[PDB]
Design a protein around this ligand. Structure first.
Ligand SMILES: *[C@@H]1O[C@H](CO)[C@@H](O)[C@H](O)[C@H]1NC(C)=O
Ligand SMILES: *[C@@H]1O[C@H](CO)[C@@H](O)[C@H](O)[C@H]1NC(C)=O
Lengths: 100, 49, 22, 99, 50, 49
């Protein structure tokens, strides 16, 4: 067996497509080379058959179709955002409040 | 929209860069991308000021 | 609200967040 | 660098703070008979952490069935020897490398 | 198998216009309610077509 | 590397080059396959260099 590495367009590759699926939980998926984190959710929109993945105004993967299943999934990240602390002076007391 | 800028790198996505290029050599490209993003953020901050 | 500022309100239509005013 | 020795035998980190020293010696490491005194691990379950050696003479299993220390059908050993002769070519010459 | 033919009449080619034709999908990326711009090989509008 | 694998008849699978573990991950193109029959210990004659 003689191989040619990085001398032709990619035609033959191995089984790198993961095993299963997880819904309602943000995971670091890899949709055929597109790695990102988001919660897989069913999308109301209709996808044309030739389309592979969707892009929002931010030019980021927010929708995608499965490489094996014709159904389409949405990429929405799980709970993110900053946290703020409301506290009085340290000379007065020490109780604090947490606001998201 | 400035997040999707190449900034002289091979691609605007960094996980693919880390997967296809080892972090020893991809560190320079990642540094260039993040400093371009920081320059854009500083320009936005100055405009907001 | 008075209708004038109601009409004026009708006339006007990833890390970044919009904090509502106090 | 990613290769065969660099992945299983001796892996260097991203920053090394120094370098390596290597030279060729076809006289102090090659004998008239077969000099098979040098071996290297070729099979491993996963990658190797930098700056540590995992000396473990264990059978690597490839198939679903396990082996009780018997090299049978799909069970092989990682350590493979090197063929070193004074009449060998440059690609087969032994290289003395110190880090 | 090919055979020479002499029943073809000689006539210069005609030229018409390509007003609003020659636009396709640049890639399989789904886009909704957005005005996207890209640089690919495209047929120019109001161009000569044979 | 599963339709044949090592589950085939016994191989003298000690060959320099690419390890079988990363052989599956390889995206090589235009593979050349040459099949022939030899006698005895001539397997070691089929080696690079
Ligand atoms: C493999 O993909 C094809 C089309 O992409 C699909 O029809 C088929 O069901 C897939 N195989 C499995 C096991 O899902
Ligand atoms: C196209 O080219 C022909 C000659 O090649 C010319 O007579 C004709 O006017 C052209 N049409 C347009 C729309 O440019």
């Amino acid at each position: 067996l003689s191989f040619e590495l990085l001398h032709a367009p990619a035609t033959v590759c191995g089984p790198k497509k993961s095993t299963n699926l997880v819904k309602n939980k943000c995971v670091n998926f890899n949709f055929n080379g597109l790695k990102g984190t988001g919660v897989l959710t069913e999308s109301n929109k209709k996808f044309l058959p030739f389309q592979q993945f969707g892009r929002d105004i931010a030019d980021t993967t927010d929708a995608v179709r499965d490489p094996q299943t014709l159904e389409i999934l949405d990429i929405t990240p799980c709970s993110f955002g900053g946290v703020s602390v409301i506290t009085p002076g340290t000379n007065t007391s020490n109780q604090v409040a947490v606001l998201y | 929209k400035q997040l999707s800028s190449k900034f002289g790198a091979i691609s605007s996505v960094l996980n693919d860069i880390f997967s296809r290029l080892d972090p020893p050599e991809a560190e320079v490209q990642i540094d260039r991308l993040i400093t371009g993003r920081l320059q854009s953020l500083q320009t936005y901050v100055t405009q907001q000021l | 609200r008075s209708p004038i500022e109601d009409l004026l309100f009708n006339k006007v239509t990833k890390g970044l967040t919009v904090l509502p005013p106090l | 660098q990613t290769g065969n020795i660099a992945d299983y035998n001796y892996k260097l980190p991203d920053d090394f703070t120094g370098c390596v020293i290597a030279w060729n010696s076809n006289k102090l490491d090659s004998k008239v008979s077969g000099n098979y005194n040098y071996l290297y691990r070729l099979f491993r379950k996963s990658n190797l952490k930098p700056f540590e050696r995992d000396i473990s003479t264990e059978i690597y299993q490839a198939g679903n069935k396990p082996c009780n220390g018997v090299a049978g059908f799909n069970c092989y050993f990682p350590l493979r020897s090197y063929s070193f002769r004074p009449t060998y070519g440059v690609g087969h010459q032994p290289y003395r490398v110190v880090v | 198998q090919c055979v020479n033919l002499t029943t073809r009449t000689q006539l210069p080619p005609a030229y018409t216009n390509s007003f609003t034709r020659g636009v396709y999908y640049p890639d399989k990326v789904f886009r909704s309610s957005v005005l996207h711009s890209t640089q690919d090989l495209f047929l120019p509008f109001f161009s000569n077509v044979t | 590397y599963s339709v044949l694998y090592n589950l085939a008849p016994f191989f003298t699978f000690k060959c320099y080059g690419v390890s079988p573990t990363k052989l599956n991950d390889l995206c090589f193109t235009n593979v050349y396959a040459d099949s022939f029959v030899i006698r005895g210990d001539e397997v070691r004659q089929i080696a690079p260099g």
